[PDB]
Amino acid sequence: LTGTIEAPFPEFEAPPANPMEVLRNWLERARRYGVREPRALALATVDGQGRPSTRIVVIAELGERGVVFATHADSQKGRELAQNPWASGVLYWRESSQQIILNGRAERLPDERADAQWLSRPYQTHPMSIASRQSETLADIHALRAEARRLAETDGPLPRPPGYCLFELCLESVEFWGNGTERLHERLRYDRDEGGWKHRYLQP
Amino acid sequence: LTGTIEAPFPEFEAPPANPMEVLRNWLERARRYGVREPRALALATVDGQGRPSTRIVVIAELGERGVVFATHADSQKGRELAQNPWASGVLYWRESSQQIILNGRAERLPDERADAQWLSRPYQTHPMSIASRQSETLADIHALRAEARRLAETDGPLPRPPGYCLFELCLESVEFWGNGTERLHERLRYDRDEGGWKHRYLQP
Ligand SMILES: Cc1cc2nc3c(=O)[nH]c(=O)nc-3n(C[C@H](O)[C@H](O)[C@H](O)COP(=O)(O)O)c2cc1C
Numbered sequence: 001l002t003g004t005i006e007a008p009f010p011e012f013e014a015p016p017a018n019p020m021e022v023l024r025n026w027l028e029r030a031r032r033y034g035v036r037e038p039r040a041l042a043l044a045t046v047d048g049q050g051r052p053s054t055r056i057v058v059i060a061e062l063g064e065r066g067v068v069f070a071t072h073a074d075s076q077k078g079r080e081l082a083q084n085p086w087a088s089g090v091l092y093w094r095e096s097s098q099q100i101i102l103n104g105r106a107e108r109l110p111d112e113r114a115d116a117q118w119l120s121r122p123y124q125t126h127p128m129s130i131a132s133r134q135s136e137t138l139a140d141i142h143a144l145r146a147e148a149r150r151l152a153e154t155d156g157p158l159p160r161p162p163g164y165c166l167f168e169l170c171l172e173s174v175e176f177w178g179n180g181t182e183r184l185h186e187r188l189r190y191d192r193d194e195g196g197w198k199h200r201y202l203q204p
Numbered sequence: 205l206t207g208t209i210e211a212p213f214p215e216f217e218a219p220p221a222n223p224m225e226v227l228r229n230w231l232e233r234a235r236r237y238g239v240r241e242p243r244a245l246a247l248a249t250v251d252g253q254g255r256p257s258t259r260i261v262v263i264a265e266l267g268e269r270g271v272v273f274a275t276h277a278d279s280q281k282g283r284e285l286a287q288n289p290w291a292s293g294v295l296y297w298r299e300s301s302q303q304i305i306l307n308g309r310a311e312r313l314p315d316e317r318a319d320a321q322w323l324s325r326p327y328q329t330h331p332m333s334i335a336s337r338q339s340e341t342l343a344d345i346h347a348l349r350a351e352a353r354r355l356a357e358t359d360g361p362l363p364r365p366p367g368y369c370l371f372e373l374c375l376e377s378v379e380f381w382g383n384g385t386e387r388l389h390e391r392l393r394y395d396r397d398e399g400g401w402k403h404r405y406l407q408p
Pocket residue numbers: 040053054055056057058059069070071072075076077078134135205301302303381408
């Protein structure tokens with residue numbers, strides 16, 4: 001590992017009852033430490049044959065019960081999630097040698113949430129998001145580029161495109177992982193059932 | 205995107221026929237760019253309920269047809285792979301704004317390969333990999349720490365522990381993603397077919 005910052009993990013010896021509280025604390029410190037792109041989540045979805053796929057998406061919002069991300073409903077992750085809502089993401093912060101694993105069911109939020117989040121983006125991002133049909137075959141790159149440039153001509157916000165949506169990943173289990181000392185990595189694992197949240201430690 | 209390096213995607217316009225050639229190119233360039241931990245793979249595996257789980261593992265070797273990583277057979281990932289070999293991993297390189305998605309089936313290599321790999325590791329790594337039962341519940345961190353300290357009393361190399369193994373993820377489809385210009389991300393997607401590999405471009 002290449003981290004130079006021994007990150008406090010005071011939640012290891014004393015675990016909060018709710019994993020959302022550790023997730024907030026950790027993101028707050030990542031911010032202080034200048035962690036480069038701490039919300040880049042490596043997100044796994046699963047196809048109808050039990051075969052996973054992965055890509056980076058950004059955690060756009062923290063909710064009470066989960067993390068939210070924006071994407072296109074008809075992308076590959078969107079098509080997978082429509083038949084199998086179970087997902088898992090991992091964040092890995094090289095600077096502080098920390099990993100966070102988030103497992104749960106990701107479900108599509110109301111249109112209004114999507115409209116709000118869409119319109120929160122810098123309007124410069126809207127052209128390609130409308131022009132591209134995410135994850136479909138690109139037959140002509142120049143055609144796509146021209147469509148987006150014509151859209152960029154408006155020089156302001158564009159309407160949310162059909163299929164632009166938000167999913168919320170409702171947490172069913174979470175692991176917080178810290179480097180520890182002597183390779184004894186520190187693994188704090190939380191789990192949920194209709195009984196609620198419990199935690200335990202895992203061996204590295 | 206905090207991408208401090210504008211990275212060309214030389215293969216995008218006229219791609220090689222086999223994706224492993226691109227992977228090797230991309231990994232070699234990543235090292236020369238100074239990408240930090242370019243082999244930290246966010247690896248997804250899938251339980252018997254179709255629910256994915258993720259974590260980081262390091263690509264220990266490039267095989268002829270895939271990527272090799274070391275782990276423990278009775279870890280969560282290893283229990284999951286034993287019942288469903290289909291797996292997916294993403295590399296994300298913040299500095300050059302590149303991602304590589306690797307999809308395939310992961311199969312365990314012979315003991316000889318795992319022994320060689322195990323023996324190539326810095327010997328300080330041996331104690332904990334033997335003393336810990338990866339991803340089992342940790343009963344008592346002091347006791348685990350004592351056992352690894354005890355093992356370390358021997359000058360390594362120490363013997364490979366039962367269950368320490370290498371998996372090779374044999375590629376079935378690969379995506380190379382680059383940031384491109386004007387948000388028109390450059391996605392090159394390879395799929396293993398009849399007579400071997402084909403590729404196409406995907407929309408961002
Ligand atoms: C740093 C970074 C952030 C990204 N964030 C998102 C995002 O939040 N939402 C999104 O749909 N795609 C995002 N992408 C693009 C995805 O990685 C992927 O290319 C696209 O969603 C299509 O994924 P799919 O074909 O597996 O569904 C991001 C890519 C990078 C490298």
